[PDB]
Design an enzyme around this catalytic site. Structure first.
Site, mmCIF file in Angstrom:
data_model
loop_
_atom_site.group_PDB
_atom_site.id
_atom_site.type_symbol
_atom_site.label_atom_id
_atom_site.label_comp_id
_atom_site.label_asym_id
_atom_site.label_seq_id
_atom_site.Cartn_x
_atom_site.Cartn_y
_atom_site.Cartn_z
ATOM 1 N N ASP A 90 70.138 49.315 47.063
ATOM 2 C CA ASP A 90 71.436 49.665 46.473
ATOM 3 C C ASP A 90 71.248 49.944 44.979
ATOM 4 O OD1 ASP A 90 72.156 48.790 49.027
ATOM 5 O OD2 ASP A 90 73.780 47.471 48.321
ATOM 6 N N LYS A 137 78.324 53.278 47.788
ATOM 7 C CA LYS A 137 78.880 51.939 47.735
ATOM 8 C C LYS A 137 79.946 51.847 46.617
ATOM 9 C CE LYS A 137 76.995 47.159 47.415
ATOM 10 N NZ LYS A 137 77.170 46.526 46.107
ATOM 11 N N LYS A 171 79.580 51.612 52.064
ATOM 12 C CA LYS A 171 79.488 50.174 51.909
ATOM 13 C C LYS A 171 80.578 49.711 50.942
ATOM 14 C CE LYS A 171 76.506 46.232 50.583
ATOM 15 N NZ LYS A 171 75.133 45.856 50.076
#
Lengths: 255, 255
Positions: free
Chosen positions: B125, B187, B216
């Site tokens: 991430d 995300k 996400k």
């Protein structure tokens, strides 16, 4: 066996500093109040906001030139830009390594430091691995600082200990380890934690590390009064994004 | 030639997405509900606190095993530990790159990603350079993501766009750019900004990126109902440190 022996030696040095603190420490000012020029000379004028733009960094650098601040402090992506903006001045370019969480692999921190200096950084403010310090993993914490310090040998490394997450013994431990790893400064805070600089923490840190190492107070330093207080209790540098209002308050209320 | 022309192509793609958004966008759910098994399979059980200790990470990993979470998410210094702790299970080890501020040099992000995969991370991430995105430096942002994606080819990269700092056109731009650069997920948040996941954000991002890219949802997801809502509005994965209470919450109230 060498690293567990060194872990042991570190633990003993921490214990000796804790014992001395317990028997001898007293909270008191290091100097009388600082003037406007002292405050300007201390200031590392900062923008570490993730949403800072190139024009923001241009404005920061202009402000540092206009107010004769010691340096600017920017995120690594903006180091070459700040160097370009400041070319021909004595304004220092400071950046941050493993910041603000301090939880990167050591080799990442070391690489980031090397890259920063290649890009034109004069000084590095790194973040300690707070979790491993709290776990008393002294050798890990030492090698983590040591790797950065070594990687940019000859350049100023400051270790942000992030006081807001530390108890007193851990503050002392962070300072002792930073000194042993050959860092040039300790620093209170990132400004991205739960708390910033306090007079108490600055003074303790200066008392542990001594006259030969610097202390940089940062986080929450909004006014001329805040700046003067931190300097009065042992800060050699001030990290703040409020340099301009600090200078204006000084001129207005104390000029 | 390459850079000015890539800048231009990206601007046009962003404009096309924005035009489609203005013409056709509707906020509404992608599915009627989600149950406890869906939530377990979405959850990336997270501890990114800078003060997190090895013992805290051991506890996180135990919790992921007991609850059959999809993954754990930890800072890069703990990827090796998490991998060691989860050996013999299929719980993924996710870490974070350029996190949480996204303002490192691109080469630091790419090296950090490589070092994480070497240390055993399954997914990365990363954080977008928010400031360069806000300055409309599309080619910089693109190359920043592209460099990381290519450095860890074969591993999932999620781009954290940090919605709390973005307007609507910026959210679309960040998604379009992440898609173009070959990221597998976008995300919402780091959990270290000024805001976290919203259903409106999750759904906008899912609508922009489509069925073959993931979203996400992270930041502020404290309850089972929070988790279910995000999934209903398009989240494929849930970043949270509240995994255990999320699951106990759903078991109690829903079976």
């Amino acid at each position: 066996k060498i690293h567990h022996h060194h872990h042991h030696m570190i633990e003993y040095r921490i214990e000796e500093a804790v014992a001395k603190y317990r028997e001898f420490y007293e909270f008191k000012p290091v100097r009388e109040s600082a003037g406007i020029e002292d405050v300007k000379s201390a200031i590392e004028h900062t923008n570490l906001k993730p949403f800072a733009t190139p024009d923001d960094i241009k404005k920061l650098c202009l402000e540092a030139r206009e107010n004769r601040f010691h340096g600017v402090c920017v995120n690594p992506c903006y180091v070459k830009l700040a160097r370009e903006e400041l070319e021909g001045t004595d304004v220092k370019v400071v950046t941050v390594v493993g910041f603000p969480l301090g939880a990167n692999e050591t080799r990442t921190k070391a690489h980031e430091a090397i890259f920063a200096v290649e890009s034109g950084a004069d000084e590095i403010d790194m973040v300690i691995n707070v979790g491993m310090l709290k776990a008393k993993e002294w050798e890990y914490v030492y090698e983590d600082i040591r790797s950065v310090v070594e990687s940019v040998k000859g350049k100023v490394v400051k270790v942000i200990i992030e006081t807001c997450y530390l108890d007193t013994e851990e503050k002392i431990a962070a300072c002792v380890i930073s000194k042993l790893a050959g860092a040039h400064f300790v620093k209170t805070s990132t400004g991205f934690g739960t708390g910033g600089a306090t007079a108490e923490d600055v003074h303790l840190m200066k008392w542990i590390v001594g006259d030969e190492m610097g202390v940089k107070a940062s986080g929450g330093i909004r006014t001329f009064e805040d700046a003067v207080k931190m300097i009065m209790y042992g800060a050699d540098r001030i990290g703040t994004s409020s340099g301009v209002k600090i200078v204006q308050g000084g001129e207005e209320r104390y000029g």
